[PDB]
Every structure is written in C-alpha cells, then in structure tokens.
C-alpha cells in the first residue's frame, strides 16, 4: 500500500517505486482457467500452454 | 531579436550535432538570431522522447528540431498535430500525411 | 494524458487497449514508471516488462 503520493509522470529524474516490482511477479505467476482455456504466462508477459 | 528552438539529438549522433553548429554559425544574421536548446537522449525510449518534448514546450520554443525512430515516430506526430508546434526532421518520412 | 492522469491518481495496475499507432507509447511508460499493464490487444514483439 504505497499511500505516498505518486505525483506526476514528468519527474526529473523519473523515479519508479519498488513495490511495482512486487506486482508483476504476482501477475506472471497466475495459472487459472477462463473462457479461452489454460492461462499460463511467461517471464515476458506472453501466454503459453 | 532572439528566437528559441529546441533540439533532440541521439546519443552517438556526433556528426549531426557537429553539422548543427556549422549550420548555425554560417546561416547566422546580425539582425535576427536563433537560440538552440540542445537535449541528448536515447531515441527509442518514447518516455524520454516525451520527456524531452514537454520540457521544451515548457520553454516556449517556436519550432523543434529533432530525430525519431520507429519507436517514437507516432509519439511526435500525435504531439505536433495536437500541440500545433512544428517539427523539422532528417528521419525517415512518415507514411500518410501528418500536419 | 490519460496515462498521466491515472498515474497522478495513483493506481496499482492499468487495464486498457492499445493500437499500432500507440503501442510504443505504452511499452515505454510501463518500462519507465514500472506500472504493470494488462491488455487483450495484439502481442508486442520483443521482451517487454
């Protein structure tokens, strides 16, 4: 919960926030079933299986 | 008077920036003068292309010189068509028409 | 400006569509500001975080 204010997108220098690294690792490590079938991801973000 | 333009140059583009200074010294006049603001950037990073663009629209430039790649060609044409600023470029031409 | 509006609001992920004339605007910003982007559009070629 990054309740610290994100600010604008035009930051000099633009700075990330390291809890964003936490989010995509959860997003890639999801294997559920949906309308198309087996939703299995890669490290890239593309679908496999 | 002194007018203000913006420059967008790739890192590794040594000769063109050298060719940019030779053009300014020769085509200078005594009456009206052009003032560049040069920026060096990666040109494939469309964030940095956007970041360099809006920084120079904050300066209030009259026209912009710069390059673009395949990654950034849509970024410029969507901006210059919206923000009504002119962009002069030696890059490959855009397919279709863009103001 | 619709991207920077929601990043000024602060979000954890963004769902949305892109097109061919806007895909590199997306894949540059999500690499920069580290905001994950889930989308049904055509697959980008390359290894995009």
Curated annotation (Swiss-Prot), chain B:
It comes from the Eukaryota. It is found in: Cell membrane; Postsynaptic cell membrane; Postsynaptic density membrane. Palmitoylated. Depalmitoylated upon L-glutamate stimulation. The postsynaptic actions of L-glutamate are mediated by a variety of receptors that are named according to their selective agonists. This receptor binds AMPA (quisqualate) > L-glutamate > kainate. Homotetramer or heterotetramer of pore-forming glutamate receptor subunits. Tetramers may be formed by the dimerization of dimers. May interact with MPP4. Forms a ternary complex with GRIP1 and CSPG4. Interacts with ATAD1 in an ATP-dependent manner. ATAD1-catalyzed ATP hydrolysis disrupts binding to ATAD1 and to GRIP1 and leads to AMPAR complex disassembly. Interacts with GRIP2. Interacts with GRIP1. Interacts with NSF via its C-terminus. Interacts with CACNG2, PICK1 and GRIP2. Interacts with GRIA1 and SYNDIG1. Part of a complex containing GRIA2, NSF and NAPA and/or NAPB. Belongs to the glutamate-gated ion channel (TC 1.A.10.1) family. GRIA2 subfamily. The M4 transmembrane segment mediates tetramerization and is required for cell surface expression. This is Glutamate receptor 2.
């Amino acid at each position: 919960s990054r309740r610290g204010n994100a600010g604008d997108c035009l930051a000099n220098p633009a700075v990330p926030w390291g809890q964003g690294v936490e989010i995509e690792r959860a997003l890639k490590q999801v294997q559920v079933e949906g309308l198309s079938g087996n939703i299995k991801f890669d490290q890239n973000g593309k679908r496999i299986n | 008077n002194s007018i203000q333009i913006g420059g967008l140059f790739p890192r590794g583009a040594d000769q063109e920036y050298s060719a940019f200074r030779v053009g300014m010294v020769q085509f200078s006049t005594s009456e009206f003068r052009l003032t560049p603001h040069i920026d060096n950037l990666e040109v494939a990073n469309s964030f940095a292309v956007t970041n360099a663009f809006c920084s120079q629209f904050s300066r209030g430039v009259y026209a912009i010189f710069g390059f673009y790649d395949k990654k950034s060609v849509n970024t410029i044409t969507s901006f210059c068509g919206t923000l009504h600023v002119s962009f002069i470029t030696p890059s490959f031409p855009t397919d279709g028409t863009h103001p």
